[PDB]
């Protein structure tokens, strides 16, 4: 459960998700990670589900780096009301994720353990995923 | 311990705040006075060409004072600045007091320039 | 004015024979001594501000002034007005005339002070000593208001290092804790 405890504004515009990832494109903390291929809002509930799904299967191993944070709130007008008459109340928090962005980072385990943990994380996410690793040119 | 600024350091800021008020460039030049610890200097500078129209001081081969800028004998070079101004056809100037408070002996130079022909 | 001739006749060659200098003239003079009151009125109740400021006139011959707050602080407000505390900046040859009677009588008169500031330097050459009572100065009379009013002194040395300021204030005559 991730959320900011204080915000400058409680109601914000929904924004746009055009283009690739501005940052967080390359894996640089862990050894393996998930690279996003499509853009959608990722709810903190989905982030918690993916984190528990990785952490349970990695009961012995390193820690998980969560590269995304749900800083943008979304508002939800109450049901069965007419359109307009003011913006509704904020309901939850989402993270704006663009294609190419690294979502979660794992180091300190084997190859197949990391692949299966990332598959179990990816089956909870609403986006198409792929497996990436660190490249050492370099 | 204390490394307070020099008297010339705040004098430059005072000169900057004085020169903001008067431009000195309308075909009418300015009379700049620099007071040192030993004697005084005087120059006439006009923007934008920056040429010095007239300049005089106590430190010269002629005009043995020989007070060299302590007493009210600085009025001699104060009127000699107006003499070099009148020999080159200067009509009028403004007074650029610099970072010095106008109570003398820069005021003595200003009064000597006023009595000798500069109508400021 | 005796200490004014005394330091120029004794300490000024002593510093240059202590260790080498690029400049022969570079003796560090003294610059300012400030006295700080900080009464607080215990608390905000003493309305005799004009007598509290004139209490400082016995210590320093120049007229002291009250100081005004720059920011209100929630414990003891003291708003932007109501000036509380006193600061006097005394200069001239009166540094020499003040330090003469200071190192004459003020330091040994205290019942428990035997050494101050073996570590209390600022790192750039500051001496600051705390005075708690008025009985230290002999010119203060014993039939005064008798309440505990403390003095503060700040000694400013022209030399910019601790190793120079400490070696000047050792040989000017003011003792240290050691």
């Amino acid at each position: 459960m991730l959320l900011p405890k204080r915000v400058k504004y409680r109601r914000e515009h929904r924004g746009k998700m055009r283009g690739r990832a501005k940052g967080g494109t390359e894996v640089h903390f862990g050894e393996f990670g998930i690279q996003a291929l499509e853009a959608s809002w990722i709810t903190n509930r989905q982030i918690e589900a993916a984190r528990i799904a990785m952490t349970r299967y990695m009961k012995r191993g390193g820690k998980v780096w969560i590269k995304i944070f749900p800083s943008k709130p979304y508002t939800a007008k109450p049901l069965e009301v007419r359109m307009g008459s003011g913006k509704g109340a904020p309901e939850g928090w989402v993270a704006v994720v663009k294609p190419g962005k690294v979502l979660f980072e794992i180091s300190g385990v084997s190859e197949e353990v990391a692949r299966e943990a990332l598959r179990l994380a990816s089956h909870k996410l609403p986006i198409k995923t792929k497996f990436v690793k660190r490249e050492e040119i370099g | 311990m204390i490394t307070k600024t020099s008297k010339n350091a705040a004098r430059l800021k005072r000169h900057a705040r004085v020169r903001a008020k008067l431009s000195g460039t309308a075909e009418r030049p300015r009379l700049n006075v620099f007071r040192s610890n030993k004697h005084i200097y005087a120059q006439i500078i006009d923007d934008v060409n920056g040429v010095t129209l007239a300049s005089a001081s106590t430190l010269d081969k002629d005009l043995n004072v020989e007070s060299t800028g302590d007493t009210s004998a600085a009025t001699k070079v104060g009127e000699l600045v107006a003499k070099r101004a009148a020999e080159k056809g200067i009509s009028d100037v403004v007074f650029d007091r610099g970072g010095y408070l106008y109570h003398g002996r820069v005021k003595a130079l200003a009064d000597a320039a006023r009595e000798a022909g500069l109508k400021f | 004015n005796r200490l004014k001739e005394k330091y120029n006749k004794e300490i000024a060659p002593a510093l240059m024979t202590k260790f080498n200098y690029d400049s022969v003239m570079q003796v560090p003079k003294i610059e300012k001594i400030v006295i700080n009151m900080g009464v607080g009125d215990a608390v905000q109740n003493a309305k005799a501000i004009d007598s509290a400021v004139e209490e400082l006139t016995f210590i320093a011959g120049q007229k002291p002034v009250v100081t005004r707050a720059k920011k209100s602080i929630a414990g003891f407000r003291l708003r932007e007005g109501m000036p509380i505390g006193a600061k006097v900046t005394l200069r001239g040859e009166r540094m020499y005339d003040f330090l003469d009677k200071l190192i004459s009588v003020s330091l040994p008169r205290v019942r428990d002070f035997r050494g101050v500031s073996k570590k209390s330097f600022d790192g750039r050459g500051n001496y600051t000593l705390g005075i708690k009572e008025q009985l230290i100065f002999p010119e203060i009379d014993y039939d005064k208001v008798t309440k505990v009013r403390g003095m503060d002194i700040v000694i400013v040395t022209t030399a910019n290092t601790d190793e120079e300021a400490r070696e000047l204030l050792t040989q000017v005559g003011m003792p240290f804790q050691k």
Binding site: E80, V81, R82, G86 | - | -
Partner: protein, 82 residues
């Protein structure tokens, strides 16, 4: 089944004041006319240009408006006679 909800509490705004440039670079200008409308000195007055009480930049003489810069992040309006 209709149900009501409210309210907005943010439905007010002031009238927009038409700031910005009123003349252009290289344009002939008459004396006294408004060059640039301001809230504070976003652009400083320069040669033959005064600043009003509402910080309005205006030409003092007839001429040609030139936009310059003080440096590094400061601007100027000047009017030079023809």
């Amino acid at each position: 089944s209709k149900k009501g909800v409210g309210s907005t509490k943010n439905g007010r705004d002031s009238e927009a004041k038409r700031l910005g440039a009123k003349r252009a670079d290289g344009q002939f200008v008459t004396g006294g006319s408004i060059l640039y409308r301001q809230r504070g000195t976003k652009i400083y007055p320069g040669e033959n240009v005064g600043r009003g009480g509402d910080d309005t930049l205006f030409a003092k003489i007839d001429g040609t408006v030139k936009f310059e810069r003080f440096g590094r992040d400061r601007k100027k309006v000047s009017v030079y006679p023809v």
